[PDB]
Design a protein around this ligand. Structure first.
Ligand SMILES: OC[C@H]1O[C@H](O)[C@H](O)[C@@H](O)[C@@H]1O
Ligand SMILES: OC[C@H]1O[C@H](O)[C@H](O)[C@@H](O)[C@@H]1O
Ligand SMILES: OC[C@H]1O[C@H](O)[C@H](O)[C@@H](O)[C@@H]1O
Ligand SMILES: OC[C@H]1O[C@H](O)[C@H](O)[C@@H](O)[C@@H]1O
Ligand SMILES: OC[C@H]1O[C@](O)(CO)[C@@H](O)[C@@H]1O
Ligand SMILES: OC[C@H]1O[C@](O)(CO)[C@@H](O)[C@@H]1O
Ligand SMILES: OC[C@H]1O[C@](O)(CO)[C@@H](O)[C@@H]1O
Ligand SMILES: OC[C@H]1O[C@](O)(CO)[C@@H](O)[C@@H]1O
Ligand SMILES: [Mn+2]
Ligand SMILES: [Mn+2]
Ligand SMILES: [Mn+2]
Ligand SMILES: [Mn+2]
Ligand SMILES: [Mn+2]
Ligand SMILES: [Mn+2]
Ligand SMILES: [Mn+2]
Ligand SMILES: [Mn+2]
Ligand SMILES: [Mn+2]
Ligand SMILES: [Mn+2]
Ligand SMILES: [Mn+2]
Ligand SMILES: [Mn+2]
Ligand SMILES: [Mn+2]
Ligand SMILES: [Mn+2]
Ligand SMILES: [Mn+2]
Ligand SMILES: [Mn+2]
Ligand SMILES: [Mn+2]
Ligand SMILES: [Mn+2]
Ligand SMILES: [Mn+2]
Ligand SMILES: [Mn+2]
Lengths: 387, 387, 387, 387
């Protein structure tokens, strides 16, 4: 059971299963994969689609003709397997030129290079059918306080995204942008470090409707934040355009563990929220098979991502359908949370004596919330111990 | 030297110096302070004014007659000292009735009660001359995943703030609201956990121009975030309405140490920012003298907040005036960061071969940023090691 | 199913279910419990025993006769229910006198008071049949760097524990001490902040055999550390004398959530280790029912602690008995880890050419560890999805 | 002013200034440095000596003939400058063969290979005059719970260190070992994650007198720990054999910033401790110049490490010499902390009614500790704001 199919909309970046195992303290432990091989193996495991950085598909500094050849072989593998490409992105972080950023580099000529590199890949994305374009500003930030004027840096970030909006609009492309936050690493502090910050920024853009977030489980957990809560805020604002699923064990380096690993309960509440809210975008796994693994472990790890999603989905659906849970939800007044506080309006509220002058504060204070019994029903469902 | 004057705009909460020393593990170590005594002593140390929660000034459940007696004695002390009251705030966290929140309590009647409690104190704040009203949603949140539907809770949060805005608009009050974020404590996770999340939420209110943020140094540091970067983003958006200054030693419980303690470098960079940007609001200290101290230590800790601000103000000014610094700032191309990427416009950028096709990537990549030299000049100035 | 009985050796402190809900930002939400009532209710839920601080059982500053009466009523409740008292401890943290510590207070007269208070409760512990005496130095540390000379503080800590060792030895008591570490809260930094630190210290005591650790799940997670790993080190040294079980969501204030909540996977690996290693001490829950709950939630929360242990035990036993897991363990060379590296000795190792001169480094490097498949079998077992 | 001299005992790893700037997300930004060039440039900035991993000096897999050519050119540069080599260490982390560890790899042959690699470099270290040999078990650990039996792994760790001690004992070498802890990265969790855990482990080795710790400022701060407190415990136990000085901004990836950056107050307190205690070992910097820098920044960052040490040394001495400070230290009873609690012995303590029965608890509790005043005097000195 728990067999993935394309109806589940699971996607993987080429850089995930293709990660060669180079870390800051050591060399690669695995050979490079041909993207064609990755397309085929993922199709067989039941994936829906693949994603790419420009540089994962076309080696940096290729001629237009070697570019043509890379894209053509990839497009044939897609046609044979039926795999789609729902999202694309730019590598503005690997090459030494980007050591101080892409869009917010201090040097003007690098910022123009970064925009040109992005625009070129936008054209390619549209040609392969991508509807979301992700931007992760992994080099945008600083190690020291004086290096970056952050107000100037935000003006340059806004500038860049406005230009990109202008481009896609002027070409008639039906693509949207999704900003991916991360708090740190590889910079000491990265600009727009959380879902909140990225949401707030988007509202100051010229055409905010074109822009959303691509939150990553591990990145918000690197700041000690509740990921389902962040996601809920992004859903509430209409801005969850895409998601990166993985695992992370607390506040440390970015681990990119397979989804389900790391904080398992947060994974459950996340799946519950995504499925209850009707999120219909890709379930995209941004993970790295650890460098201990050979290729067989690479595929077992990828298979696990999808497996763990499906198991959590089944348990969250069981939880929500259980009439004992529905009863506990009423006992905890979750239904009362969904009622407006004051649809009667301001004047009626001020005139309502039972809301102040005659409010019996001690009787309300005495009501139990019954949250611990509810949470124990959730645990029982998660663990398959509802006996 | 470094003696505060009331022109420096230093303010303190009543709850700061009046903190009796009760923590989750121990009893009070100091007697309660009469607010009249706080006002007089703060004025003597050179403070500009004081702030209050409703419940600091009028004990919860006071008759109208006691209420007036407390306000009368408070006003006289204010009159006698020339102390201002620039900000006020509501206690929606101490009483058991607020155990599941104020504005986002699952029970509707509690939510209405929280609003009426808040409104009553807005009137009092205006009477005392407050220009800013802070909200800290310390109980708004959860310890478990099922206890709060976060989309509903944000609907209720928005409803509450929209109603408060309608109130102040209809009364003709010149007062603005500032939301104070915190990521956790006393809730497992608190809603709107950081500056970014609060700035994002504001943009969805009915009258966003009336709402800004009141960031607190230690609260952002409890999520491992860079406080000056956060403040820079609030400034960029035009929403820094008030600030809470204190100290914090990394990711742990909310310490509320005196300003200058904790992350000293971040304090330097924050002062540099506030002073460079021309922030003209209060320099409010939200700190607790440690429970090891007697009253003499209370006043020493308070004096130290002001003194460290003034020391850092002088060191930041010396840093910015230093000719070697101005040369380092040019060497690191901070002036280029302040200029547009592409004020020639999108079409010219796409036509510029020097931006992409003919950009000398290896040459740009070799250019050092000279950020370490700059940062050592800043260190030298902070430490008073220049000449 | 999953019904606890005394054979499971589950114990609870009086202060756990008796926690009244006072936190740093608010008042109690529940009435005090009579310890007699707690003994009876826990007995009915299937607990083995209870633990206490001196001050949980005998109000601070009681006369010898009111002391007699408290202890007598408690001893009758124990006799009626058959509940045991396997561990006792001292409150050296609540009373204002201990604001700078007990054993490491700067003031000498407080340190002597702290030792006298502890010794008196040791006698009581022995009389009620306790075999472990826990010390948690919650006030031992500092908020500022100059306040405490830490070498002096360690000399005073050693002094105190040596005196206590001398006492129990001279009385012929068969009780052992267990040091409980915590990294911070309510002090900025607490002395002996982790399991490691406490282990290292114990080796410098006059009679190290009398002393062990009482590690708490949430406390090691407050420093971002792996709790099963810490426990394994404590087991390896022969020093795991007792354990505090609960849950915690990462690096923040001490949450004391019910066991199973917080990091669920770490809970599974913990149970696996305790049951595999044959740990035979109490399974003691140090948790606080959240302040949202009434008394019914208090008992549901306590019941959950034991339930979640039993469910995890069943899944870890299933995991270990699965011949497919046993195969995966061999594939990952866990059996090879248990073989000595060089039982042939130093000279034989230096003379072994296949270990260096002829070691084929590239062939060894190419071996996969197969850890991801093993971990996925663990996840499957935990979630009850081995289909 | 603040010019280092070789008498200040400042040392640097070859890998520090030679770090090429390759991080997990980007390519090298600087060319490799010839170790001869590092030695000469460091000597010019006033360094005392250098340290090396085997693989820094002799590339992995070098013939014996290349090995000798590299050592010969290195020795000549050492001779020419007067530079010492006080410490050496083994790279058991970069090559794929060490992907599951060196001493604790699940495969036995890898463990034997790690030992032989280490032994070969101990000989070379002794030849160059090293008195300390550091071990950093960067690969010793796990990403998942089942992958490592931690009791077995510690048996293997002990075996490895015991063998190294037998080696040095049998050769007659005057060299000591120092274990360098780190909590995580590049492993999910690393074994012996903190100073405490390493100190504890040492006591279980066959010849513990030969083993001490090499703590690193940023590594302890990655667990949110107080570095000066950790150093104080190592000193107390007589085990501070070497130290790594650098900077770190809280709980995240290992930043290895220049010393003085990061937590500046903790740096002040650390210098105060080292200088007060008379630590006579090397002041070793384990830092990486950020990848934004060119070679001129490399040397600036290195010079800055030394300079910040010397500035803080002067400020700590001024603090300790200040008469107002000595008075504050008496007011806070630091002198009483240095004296015994009960040098009258256990029987006298139990007989002393002033210690318990007749102790005036309310009077002792009212005494302020005066820690804030003390700490503001320390702030004033660090900032150079005293007179
Ligand atoms: O979208 C860009 C992607 O770029 C990189 O691979 C980042 O590490 C990953 O977090 C992100 O999702
Ligand atoms: O403004 C409201 C204030 O309420 C409480 O005292 C908080 O702990 C504090 O951080 C906040 O600034
Ligand atoms: O043993 C003493 C006990 O004291 C307190 O209740 C602590 O909060 C708890 O962590 C500890 O287990
Ligand atoms: O001594 C061994 C050294 O090895 C590596 O370079 C580590 O990253 C470092 O922290 C350590 O000090
Ligand atoms: O409890 C009083 C009840 O009345 C309401 O305020 C409105 O129906 C409920 O939300 C609350 O739970
Ligand atoms: O010292 C002040 C700080 O100390 C604590 O009591 C310890 O938990 C906090 O609640 C408070 O903010
Ligand atoms: O793999 C070579 C094998 O030979 C051993 O070193 C000894 O049996 C094993 O531990 C290793 O896995
Ligand atoms: O700037 C130096 C630091 O930068 C990083 O590359 C970013 O991940 C770390 O690996 C390194 O220690
Ligand atoms: Mn299906
Ligand atoms: Mn699919
Ligand atoms: Mn940048
Ligand atoms: Mn990631
Ligand atoms: Mn990602
Ligand atoms: Mn009164
Ligand atoms: Mn007057
Ligand atoms: Mn928004
Ligand atoms: Mn605070
Ligand atoms: Mn505040
Ligand atoms: Mn049973
Ligand atoms: Mn039991
Ligand atoms: Mn102490
Ligand atoms: Mn705890
Ligand atoms: Mn405990
Ligand atoms: Mn060579
Ligand atoms: Mn010579
Ligand atoms: Mn030990
Ligand atoms: Mn490091
Ligand atoms: Mn190091």
């Amino acid at each position: 059971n728990y067999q993935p199919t394309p109806e589940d909309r699971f996607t993987f970046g080429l850089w995930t299963v293709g990660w060669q195992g180079r870390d800051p303290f050591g060399d690669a432990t695995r050979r490079a994969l041909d993207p064609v091989e990755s397309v085929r193996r993922l199709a067989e495991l039941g994936a829906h689609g693949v994603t790419f950085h420009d540089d994962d598909l076309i080696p940096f500094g290729s001629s237009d003709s070697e570019r043509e050849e890379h894209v053509k072989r990839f497009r044939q593998a897609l046609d044979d397997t039926g795999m789609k490409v729902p999202m694309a992105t730019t590598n503005l972080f690997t090459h030494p030129v980007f050591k101080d950023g892409g869009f917010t580099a201090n040097d003007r000529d690098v910022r123009r290079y970064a925009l040109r590199k992005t625009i070129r890949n936008i054209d390619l994305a549209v040609e392969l059918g991508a509807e979301t374009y992700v931007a992760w500003g992994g080099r945008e930030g600083a190690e020291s306080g004086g290096a970056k004027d952050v107000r100037d840096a935000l003006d340059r970030m806004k500038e860049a995204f406005d230009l990109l909006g202008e481009y896609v609009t002027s070409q008639g492309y039906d693509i949207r942008f999704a900003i991916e936050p991360k708090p740190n690493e590889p910079r000491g502090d990265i600009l727009l470090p959380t879902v909140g910050h990225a949401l707030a920024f988007i509202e100051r853009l010229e055409r905010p409707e074109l822009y959303g977030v691509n939150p990553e489980v591990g990145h918000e957990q690197m700041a000690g934040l509740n990921f389902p809560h962040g996601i809920a805020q992004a859903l509430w604002a209409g801005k969850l355009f895409h998601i990166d699923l993985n695992g992370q064990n607390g506040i440390k380096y970015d681990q990119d563990l397979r989804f389900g690993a790391g904080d398992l309960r947060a994974a459950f509440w996340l799946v519950d929220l995504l499925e209850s809210a009707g999120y219909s975008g890709p379930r995209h796994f941004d993970f790295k098979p650890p460098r201990t693994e050979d290729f067989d472990g690479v595929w077992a790890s990828a298979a696990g991502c999808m497996r763990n999603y499906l198991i959590l989905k089944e348990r969250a659906a069981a939880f929500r359908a259980d009439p004992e849970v529905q009863e506990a939800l009423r006992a905890s007044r979750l239904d009362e949370l969904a009622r407006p506080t004051a649809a009667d309006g301001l004047q009626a509220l001020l005139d309502d004596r039972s809301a102040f002058e005659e409010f019996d504060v001690d009787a309300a204070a005495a009501r139990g919330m019954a949250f611990e019994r509810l949470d124990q029903l959730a645990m029982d469902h998660l663990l398959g111990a509802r006996g």
